[PDB]
Amino acid sequence: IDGYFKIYSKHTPINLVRDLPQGFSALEPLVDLPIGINITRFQTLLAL
Amino acid sequence: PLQSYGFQPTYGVGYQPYRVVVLSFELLHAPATVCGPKKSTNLVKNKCV
């Protein structure tokens, strides 16, 4: 949002095999990032 | 292309080494990140202010 980058995080336990569970939970804000650069796409990073 | 500065304490004003620092800055291409202190005062209660 206007250069500000905002990430909202939520830690929660779960016991299910593969799919998204059913229930209600909210994501509290974690930290706001004043980056100020444009973004067109993204890519994830893994541990080898 | 380079000549070496030679400074001695015997030099007068102008010939002495004058350390110079310039603080150049960029204008509003992003959210503001660097600036001065916003002063804060003591807290008061039980009176409209």
Ligand SMILES: *[C@@H]1O[C@H](CO)[C@@H](O)[C@H](O)[C@H]1NC(C)=O
């Ligand atoms: C990102 O790219 C768009 C594409 O036109 C441009 O309008 C925008 O100014 C760019 N962002 C920055 C921070 O330069």
